């Protein structure tokens, strides 16, 4: 309000927390799968979206989402967690970037292969 | 001791030695007291290669400063030319 009140109590900021706490300012984090399963998204959406509870190497254990169509993930699988949330999945805050150590690219895809780790067809 | 020598501030394959009065204990391209002109061994004709200030160089060398081997040669060349 007044200049004297501003001098007394400074016009402080408002710190906002990140939406990817388990990354600790890192683009990708290597982790090991712990629980591979499928969950039903919140209404009005309805599906069997494939998610994975994975414990990162730093110690954090989160749940990520598997994109594309078809994957070869199971227990004791090394994946590369990437930062990104799914709006229609309560709790999911991360994805698994394809083309990594074990999560191979999507089969029979020829468009947007950069986001799914698919090699250039011959 | 206090000496007047050359510090290279050019690039890859492009040397450019500024004449600086730097202490002998300091680095070649690090700390220095004052800068006295420059030298460009790659500059062709029509370009002023050397601009050493003889007045301040003499003023410094009077107070115990030491002129380096190449600096003395450049000063001699400048004096012979003009």
């Amino acid at each position: 309000a007044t200049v004297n009140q501003l001098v007394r109590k400074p016009r402080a900021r408002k710190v906002a927390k990140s939406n990817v706490p388990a990354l600790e300012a890192c683009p990708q984090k290597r982790g090991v799968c712990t629980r591979v399963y499928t969950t039903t998204p919140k209404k009005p959406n309805s599906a069997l979206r494939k998610v994975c509870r994975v414990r990162l190497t730093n110690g954090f254990e989160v749940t990520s989402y598997i994109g594309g169509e078809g994957h070869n993930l199971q227990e004791h699988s090394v994946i590369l967690i990437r930062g990104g949330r799914v709006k229609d999945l309560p709790g999911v805050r991360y994805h698994t970037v394809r083309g990594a150590l074990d999560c191979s690219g999507v089969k029979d895809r020829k468009q947007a292969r950069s986001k799914y780790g698919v090699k250039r067809p011959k | 001791m206090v000496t007047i020598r050359l510090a290279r501030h050019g690039a890859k394959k492009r040397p450019f030695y500024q004449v600086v009065v730097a202490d002998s204990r300091n680095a070649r391209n690090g700390r220095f007291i004052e800068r006295v002109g420059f030298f460009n061994p790659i500059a062709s004709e029509k370009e002023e290669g050397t601009r050493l200030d003889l007045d301040r160089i003499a003023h410094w060398v009077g107070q115990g400063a030491t002129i380096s081997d190449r600096v003395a040669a450049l000063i001699k060349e400048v004096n012979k030319a003009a």
Binding site: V3, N4, L6, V7 | -
Partner: protein
């Protein structure tokens, strides 16, 4: 010619030393507000004669014990 400051003594319960409270005027860097700031200094004055309440004039010198690096030069407005 030489730098000197003027302040108000607030405590002298020590041997050959006084405590001064100099006030200065500055402008707030952010809000542009003129507020009064204090710079308290430990000043040593041999042959103690200054009480509490009057203003004093000091000059910078070498440190004497740990934190008083100022001497008293003149005593102006000694009235209580």
């Amino acid at each position: 010619k030489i730098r000197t400051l003027q302040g108000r003594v607030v405590s002298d319960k020590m041997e050959k030393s006084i405590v001064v409270a100099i006030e200065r005027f500055v402008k707030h860097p952010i809000y542009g507000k003129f507020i009064k700031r204090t710079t308290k200094l430990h000043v040593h004055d041999e042959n103690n004669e200054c009480g509490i309440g009057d203003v004093v004039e000091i000059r910078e010198c070498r440190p004497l014990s740990k934190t008083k690096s100022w001497t008293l030069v003149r005593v102006v407005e000694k009235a209580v």
